[PDB]
Design an enzyme around this catalytic site. Structure first.
Site, PDB file in Angstrom:
ATOM      1  N   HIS A  34       0.839  -1.194   0.000  1.00 38.38           N
ATOM      2  CA  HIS A  34       0.000   0.000   0.000  1.00 38.38           C
ATOM      3  C   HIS A  34       0.876   1.248   0.000  1.00 38.38           C
ATOM      4  O   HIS A  34       2.080   1.166   0.208  1.00 38.38           O
ATOM      5  CB  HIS A  34      -0.831   0.083   1.291  1.00 38.38           C
ATOM      6  CG  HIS A  34      -1.798  -1.041   1.500  1.00 38.38           C
ATOM      7  ND1 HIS A  34      -3.130  -0.952   1.147  1.00 38.38           N
ATOM      8  CD2 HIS A  34      -1.652  -2.236   2.126  1.00 38.38           C
ATOM      9  CE1 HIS A  34      -3.746  -2.073   1.493  1.00 38.38           C
ATOM     10  NE2 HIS A  34      -2.874  -2.863   2.094  1.00 38.38           N
ATOM     11  N   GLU A 116       2.547  -0.755   4.481  1.00 38.90           N
ATOM     12  CA  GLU A 116       2.366   0.585   3.940  1.00 38.90           C
ATOM     13  C   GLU A 116       3.686   1.273   3.629  1.00 38.90           C
ATOM     14  O   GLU A 116       4.548   1.377   4.491  1.00 38.90           O
ATOM     15  CB  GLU A 116       1.604   1.443   4.955  1.00 38.90           C
ATOM     16  CG  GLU A 116       0.160   1.029   5.131  1.00 38.90           C
ATOM     17  CD  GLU A 116      -0.736   1.758   4.176  1.00 38.90           C
ATOM     18  OE1 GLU A 116      -0.212   2.366   3.213  1.00 38.90           O
ATOM     19  OE2 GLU A 116      -1.957   1.721   4.371  1.00 38.90           O
ATOM     20  N   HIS A 154      -2.441  -3.083  -3.524  1.00 43.79           N
ATOM     21  CA  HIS A 154      -3.833  -2.888  -3.126  1.00 43.79           C
ATOM     22  C   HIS A 154      -4.690  -2.652  -4.389  1.00 43.79           C
ATOM     23  O   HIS A 154      -5.813  -3.144  -4.508  1.00 43.79           O
ATOM     24  CB  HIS A 154      -3.931  -1.729  -2.125  1.00 43.79           C
ATOM     25  CG  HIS A 154      -5.224  -1.693  -1.367  1.00 43.79           C
ATOM     26  ND1 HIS A 154      -5.518  -0.719  -0.437  1.00 43.79           N
ATOM     27  CD2 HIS A 154      -6.300  -2.513  -1.407  1.00 43.79           C
ATOM     28  CE1 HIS A 154      -6.718  -0.943   0.068  1.00 43.79           C
ATOM     29  NE2 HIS A 154      -7.215  -2.024  -0.503  1.00 43.79           N
ATOM     30  N   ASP A 164      -3.315   2.670  -4.971  1.00 49.86           N
ATOM     31  CA  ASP A 164      -2.026   2.460  -4.292  1.00 49.86           C
ATOM     32  C   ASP A 164      -1.509   1.054  -4.550  1.00 49.86           C
ATOM     33  O   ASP A 164      -2.307   0.131  -4.673  1.00 49.86           O
ATOM     34  CB  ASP A 164      -2.093   2.815  -2.773  1.00 49.86           C
ATOM     35  CG  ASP A 164      -2.991   1.867  -1.933  1.00 49.86           C
ATOM     36  OD1 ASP A 164      -4.184   1.663  -2.189  1.00 49.86           O
ATOM     37  OD2 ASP A 164      -2.525   1.339  -0.913  1.00 49.86           O
TER      38      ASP A 164
HETATM   39 ZN   LIG Z   1      -4.079   0.609   0.073  1.00 53.24          ZN
END
Ligand SMILES: [Zn+2]
EC number: 3.5.1.28
Length: 180
Positions: A34, A116, A154, A164
């Site tokens: 992400h 992330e 994602h 993303d």
């Molecule tokens: Zn995401």
């Protein structure tokens, strides 16, 4: 590298209330990459920690009002300088993928680990981020070999909802550092 009861040994730990059980005690087999920045396009705040722990100040920026209602998290954040922050043990279910599908299977939170990268869809990620994402992933492959075969964005499990980690995420660069 080293894993300790679901925690990356060298990560900065910020244990978040925002997790629950993986159904069936299932071992995760999918890595979802992400990106995130709070406020949008800005880096460095305490805001990601606050969002993923359910403590964000809705008034701190206009954008925060709209997302204060979210109950979300991820397993790890990798910041611009390569700092690895972990919120949720890998054996537990973080809330990062939302409505999603991968190879016919819905609710990807169940069987994935979400990492992330601080950043945006069109800005290059840093060398430190690629190296650290690789180190984390390699450690994960060691425990969960299926992840070697299942690494995705994602955007790939939630197309037309999520973009993303965007075109900026260089899968070739990342792959070159994995499973060595
Ligand atoms: Zn995401």
């Amino acid at each position: 590298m080293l894993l300790d009861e679901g925690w990356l040994a060298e990560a900065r730990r910020v244990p978040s209330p925002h997790y629950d059980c993986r159904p069936d005690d299932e071992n995760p087999s999918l890595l979802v990459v992400h990106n995130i920045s709070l406020p949008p396009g800005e880096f460095g705040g305490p805001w990601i920690d606050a969002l993923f722990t359910g403590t964000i100040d809705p008034n701190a920026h206009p954008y925060f009002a709209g997302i204060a209602h979210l109950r979300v998290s991820a397993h790890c954040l990798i910041r611009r300088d390569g700092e690895i922050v972990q919120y949720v043990p890998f054996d537990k279910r973080a809330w990062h993928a939302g409505v999603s599908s991968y190879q016919g299977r819905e609710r990807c939170n169940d069987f994935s680990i979400g990492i992330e990268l601080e950043g945006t869809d069109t800005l290059a990620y840093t060398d430190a981020q690629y190296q650290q994402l690789a180190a984390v992933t390699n450690a994960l492959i060691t425990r969960y070999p299926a992840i070697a075969n299942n690494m995705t964005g994602h955007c790939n499990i939630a197309p037309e909802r999520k973009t993303d980690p965007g075109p900026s995420f260089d899968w070739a660069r990342f792959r070159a550092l994995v499973t060595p």
